[PDB]
């Protein structure tokens, strides 16, 4: 907005693991205000992922996030009448949010049957670093590299 530095809104942590990040993921996943359903799906996915990959639900989830967060995105600065795609360093809250968003979209795309199954598969893929959300991040980075000449001349 023009004249607003509004206060960030309060998100409660999810009951199973007490995690704010996990709560945010659930919110992003949710559709039509159906939170209960979203949390069930997220928990199912986490449980399967933990069983498949290892340590905990939260550690596995974190690993996936680490492989899908973007360091740099691009904006379109339009000053000389034409638009320069400029790179820009993506701040941490955005990095988590964007990564989560990408993961959920990839999961939605994916061909497995249950949503939980798709989510688990996608997360595992992210952890390995051979999935589609990861591909998306790679594409974003590639664009930033291409437009690196317009990095610190905005």
């Amino acid at each position: 907005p023009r004249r607003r530095v509004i206060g960030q809104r309060k998100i409660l942590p999810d009951p199973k693991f007490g995690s704010e990040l996990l709560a945010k993921f659930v919110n992003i996943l949710m559709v039509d205000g159906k939170k209960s359903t979203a949390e069930s799906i997220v928990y199912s996915a986490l449980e399967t992922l933990a069983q498949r990959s290892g340590k905990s639900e939260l550690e596995a989830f974190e690993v996936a996030l680490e492989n899908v967060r973007p360091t740099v995105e691009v904006k379109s600065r339009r000053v000389g009448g034409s638009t320069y795609q400029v790179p820009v360093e993506v701040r941490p809250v955005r990095r988590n949010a964007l990564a989560m968003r990408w993961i959920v979209e990839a999961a939605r795309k994916r061909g497995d049957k249950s949503m939980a199954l798709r989510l688990a598969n996608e997360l595992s893929d992210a952890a390995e670093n051979k999935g589609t959300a990861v591909k998306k991040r790679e594409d974003v980075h590639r664009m930033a590299e291409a437009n690196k000449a317009f990095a610190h001349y905005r």
Binding site: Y84, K148, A149, F150, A151, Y153
Partner: protein
Amino acid sequence: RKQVSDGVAHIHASFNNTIVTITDRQGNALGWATAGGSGFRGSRKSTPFAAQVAAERCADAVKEYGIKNLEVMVKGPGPGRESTIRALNAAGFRITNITDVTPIPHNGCRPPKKRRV
């Protein structure tokens, strides 16, 4: 194959392009590089970053000659004019002298006509 240790870096920095040319102190060129050959075209090759990577490329090219000291002669009005020298220093030569040799006439030949844009 030869070694010289001390070169001159001629940074021709026009508005469109940056040419970097390392030479022996006498005038004979050792290696060169441009933002164009460095992989930038148009809006991208007319930028400081392009000049910097051109400089890096030039330094790499003349690595065979083992040049340690280097004096830089900057020419023209350019987006680099600084990036190139910074890059060269980073690439790791001792910059000894920095000289501007932009050719100003003493009211000589007529310039081309003004652009109407």
